[PDB]
């Protein structure tokens, strides 16, 4: 019982944590599209400023060093965009390839459970049910086919267990490295701009 429910719990956590990794993912890609825009405009505002700098040296320097900054911010955001995207791609792999792989086993475990209980239901009905000169024939039938679907469930309860342990192990490694690369990227951006 507690070995079964302990598994269902673990599935619930994974199902819960998948959805949360997808939200972080939505927002992640939203932020990259956002930045992309913010970047394109910084190109335009860059160029716009420069034109005013050169063509109107009533105020060349005032217009000058703004166009420098707007142009500097472009290429930096350009570098940062690559990193955010790299993050998006890698998280997509974890959530929409690695996670799912384990879920496809979870499905088959759940389906094997369904046949296990069905054939279990059946054996005990032929045990509690009426009697004749033919019940014993199908009793040994119901036995072997319960014995089998038990092993079927047993085999897959084994599989899910492992996948989850192997999954937890991978997910930690990925999340960690992916999260600090995301963070380090944010650093190098402001610092890459602080230097100028």
């Amino acid at each position: 019982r507690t070995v079964d429910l302990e598994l269902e719990l673990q599935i619930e956590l994974l199902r819960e944590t998948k959805r949360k990794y997808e939200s972080v993912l939505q927002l992640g890609r939203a932020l990259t599209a956002h930045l992309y825009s913010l970047l394109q405009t910084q190109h335009a505002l860059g160029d716009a400023f420069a034109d005013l700098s050169q063509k109107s040296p009533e105020l060349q320097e005032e217009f000058g060093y703004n166009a420098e900054t707007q142009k500097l911010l472009c290429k930096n955001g350009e570098t940062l965009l690559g990193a955010v995207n790299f993050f998006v791609s890698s998280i997509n792999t974890l959530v929409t390839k690695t996670m799912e792989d384990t879920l496809m086993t979870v499905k088959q475990y759940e389906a094997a459970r369904l046949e296990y209980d069905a054939y279990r239901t059946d054996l005990e009905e032929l045990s509690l049910g009426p009697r004749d000169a033919g019940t014993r024939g199908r009793l040994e039938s119901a036995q072997a086919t319960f014995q089998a679907h038990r092993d079927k469930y047993e085999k897959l309860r084994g599989d899910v267990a492992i996948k989850l342990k192997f999954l937890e192990e991978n997910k930690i490694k990925v999340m960690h490295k992916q999260l600090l690369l995301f963070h380090n990227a944010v650093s190098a951006y402001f610092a890459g701009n602080q230097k100028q």
């Binding site: 792999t93 974890l94 390839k97 690695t98 192997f166 999954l167 192990e169 991978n170 490694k173």
Partner: peptide, 8 residues
């Protein structure tokens, strides 16, 4: 590699 790495 404790388990697996996986990349597209």
């Amino acid at each position: 590699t404790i388990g697996f790495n996986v990349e597209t």
